[model samples]
Target: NDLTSTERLIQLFESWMLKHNKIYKNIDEKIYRFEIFKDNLKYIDETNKKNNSYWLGLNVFADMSNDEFKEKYTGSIAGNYTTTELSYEEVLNDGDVNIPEYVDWRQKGAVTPVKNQGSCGSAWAFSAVSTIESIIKIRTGNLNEYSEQELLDCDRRSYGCNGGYPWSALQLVAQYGIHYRNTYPYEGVQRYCRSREKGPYAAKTDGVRQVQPYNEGALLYSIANQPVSVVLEAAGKDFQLYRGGIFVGPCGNKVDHAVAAVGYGPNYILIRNSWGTGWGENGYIRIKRGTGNSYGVCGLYTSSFYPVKN
Candidate 1:
């Protein structure tokens, strides 16, 4: 029976390779990938059998080991960076302000399509750029795709591809306007700043404001108005293979990946991921809210910020 199951998994791995367009250089590499895929498939099946709030699947990263997945897909370097203080009107302090029961910026046409970051650790750039793109659309009624490659290549404060923080990218966008996607496209790898002198900039931010750390209310209030860039721990196998459902994680508090909080519901926060539409729920994840953890789920509320465009 065990041999039969192994045979089935091998067949499944072969089909998965063809589906993902995976081309290994040698038979040894192919065997290594198949072993990893078999382990991941077993883990996914076992996790799904538990009937948890969220389930796992054979996603694009199923062929990779956990370490490889983290090294490539999860990279958000958190640090004590200087940030502007939140004013009274910026959060939920005002009594007159009422947050809606549900808010989706995508429904309002303020959000762009889900994008893939490939093997690059440029989630910081994607998070910052997507937030700015939504804000520009909200402020000027113009939805334009900005170049994350601009930040990847030009922002000296960030380490391109390896990792970065979104706040620094936003600060760079505030000073020098970001180029449009067509003008300076993404290459997924770091290169010399080729478009620093290019024209036809897409958008610029007035500045960025950090939400009060560990406050879900503050994070929700901020996201209600606009998409906010938030950092969270995304290095677990559950998160890597997350398929669908409201993710109430068995994860931790170490923030390692940057993503955008695009909207929210009464019980969950809608996050926009940069891993393409194949991962999670159409390139998004709804994490449980109101857990009373100051950091919210996966430390999402720990270091959230949004760009301002006036």
Candidate 2:
């Protein structure tokens, strides 16, 4: 049997809420509020029919109990709150990937339990998870959602969550070689990474595809045909709620954020959205096709270790 529309939307809403500490709900028909998150949540066609429907009055994020993120959420190492493995300034450090044709990578919404890296904007952590998620699927032939927090909390050779390079995240994976989420635990979003140098902090987000054509389309093609991860400079919060088209353009070196490229298609590439589900089609959006800016059509990214053929 197929899931009803309400059922599917509910699941979408549930998954989105639990991913972030954000909230959404409405008590009245005319009274409703929801933030797409990541500051640029223009994705809400709030003008769309659903915006005024029963989907309102639901603050899933605010209402979510620790148990929900800990036991219910299957994607990462869910858990309670604490001082986090990062410092205030460190967490907000931003990323460093320098792909042109886009905006600021740090401001662009990212995916996974990698938290915000505080301020690190480390797209590498997000990219690392993409490769890890793909590898998990290749190894088990099933979607085994790994924890970005595991990598963020553990990976230190880079920039701690604020912003690390892809190479750094990969090095940590090879150096530590810990366990995956299924074997370890998951913490909620906004957590920080500590030093596992003593023994082992995490399984260390593994898998790195080292190759060429690091372009967006190339990455998307791989993710479409197989699985891959890509990091790009986002257009900035102003470009957030981007429902379609390529809005990214050439920018400065402030690109300190990162994310993973999951898959793609004829028109759009499936992005594992990080901005609580309220953004896009339930925490997931597609990088629309076309080269509105010189970046070319929609692209997907991955590491050198991708295409893990069995």
Candidate 3:
């Protein structure tokens, strides 16, 4: 006798739990998670069948609803925040600038390894720190991992794990400098600022520079010179379960998560996410570029900035 659809789903859920080492507190919770997992699996299968530019998978977030995933993973509160730093256009003469067809800072040994933000809403800190790490490398020929925890703990302008903006985190680093990861390790939760007295700071930036808002050409000019900090709407299920390929979106204009634009191809922008290497093309995502939309894909053109060191 063949198993029914329900039976097959239950069996698949059991194996998934085993693979992810997931445990429920009780029968009620297990049932709830099973239902969510079933729905997520259905969505994943249906979406993959569409043969879109990107594909979803049963990654570590398969058991959570889109709402739950958004609350836990996507957290950048960039509301009406503006920067006084120099603009990228002011710093460079666009007429003579040569935008390359491809640029990957990782291959140039500028970017640090992918980091896991865990369940904390501290993507802002990670984005800022990653850009600082790259600039430090590009300027000094030394790739040093800076501390995101320092920003999470000390950047009083924004809430710690509750949510924050990368621009404010960059401002904090600019004024006070930042410590190495070893000196100020990440705890994945909000904590009292313990970095003021402990440094021997690792890196400091002159300030930050904002790219021309909603302009893809301006972004390309800035990123051609260095990696940039950016934000996007990552709450979509397609983004949450993103496994591989060029992510062309099932996304929107509401940008809530922060990431770093580490490089770009002729028609795609390479993004480095705060999630670990187990997710999304080894902790990176390629987003389609030059879509003719002012916001670009997933609002990638909305807010772009980079730390400056001279």
Candidate 4:
């Protein structure tokens, strides 16, 4: 019999944890090759059933080539006629500034993963640090990764390994610089610091203190002048939040996702999401004029982004 959606997912997680020291694995394939659990495929099947966007072939990225994949290309330049891959690491490690911690994400589920969600909760860390990461990047051109592993390893933040809010994670990002995922990557394991050669670049969120701004409008003003970070309540599947959408869901203010506002105008703020290139408008989601899905009244805390100039 097929496992219930949640149960099937739990079993698969258990199987993988038991199978590898690395906890997270990329399951971007369209079909299942293993027969160990045909029952639990419900979540994956139903989650994206309407669009079937999740059912991509094993080679979903087959056409991109090795160099075109995730960390590949090592791009040259942006806005140039020549194509340049923006190194997540290069962009992050730029300037190489130091940061402090605000909360103990380990004890707390601050930066942990929410499995059924995209990319095993890396979004939690990525979106959590987008504003903060850019603060450092904007100031110093260096992007520091707010370590997701630390959130999973330490104890002090919200639902570190289960689920967490971006605002809560941002609370920590201010205290501590964001950690690097490249050094840690997404092992999906019990959160262990990777080697210095592989790391020494990721940021920790245990030493710094942040002052969250009050509302989205103020946040937009900040982003206009600089960068503003906040979390918005995700309404599951509602018109695929792209480059221009509004928040109008009657979904009880769950506020499940996080994003940073880099720029805005009379009716829009540019946001960066962690869903990669599969969703949103070109790998990023935008806050538009009237969908009601934005951060207008969500009451998420907003913090300023600081970049180290030298």
Residue-wise C-alpha lDDT for candidate 4, range 1-310, written one tens digit per residue: 2356656655654554454333323554312323322322333345335452223111112223322232221110110121212222212112332322111221221222221123343344555555555555545555454455654444254444445444445555445444565645555444543333453435433322222233444444344434444455443333232222443232333344555555554544555555555445544444443234333533233222322222
RMSD of each: 2.7, 12.6, 2.8, 15.6
Give the runs in model 3 whose Cα sits over 4 Å from its true position: 1-8, 21-23, 78-93
lDDT of 2 by residue, 146-188 (tens): 5556666666555443444555555556556545555444443
- lDDT value for candidate 2? 0.40
TM-score on alpha carbons, each prediction: 0.92, 0.50, 0.90, 0.49
The numbered model that scores best in TM-score is 1
Model 1 lDDT-worst window of ten: 85-94
lDDT of 1 by residue, 148-180 (tens): 999999889788988887878988888778989
Candidate 4, residue 237: the lDDT equals 30
How far does residue 296 in candidate 2 sit from its true spot (Å)? 3.9
TM-score of 3: 0.90
Inter-residue clash pairs, candidate 3: none
What does candidate 4 score on TM?
A: 0.49
Whole-model Cα lDDT of every candidate shown, in order: 0.86, 0.40, 0.85, 0.39
lDDT of 4: 0.39
Q: How many residue pairs clash in each candidate?
A: 0, 56, 0, 62
Q: What is the lDDT of residue 68 in candidate 2?
A: 35
lDDT of 3 by residue, 153-196 (tens): 99997788888878889877888799999999999988898986
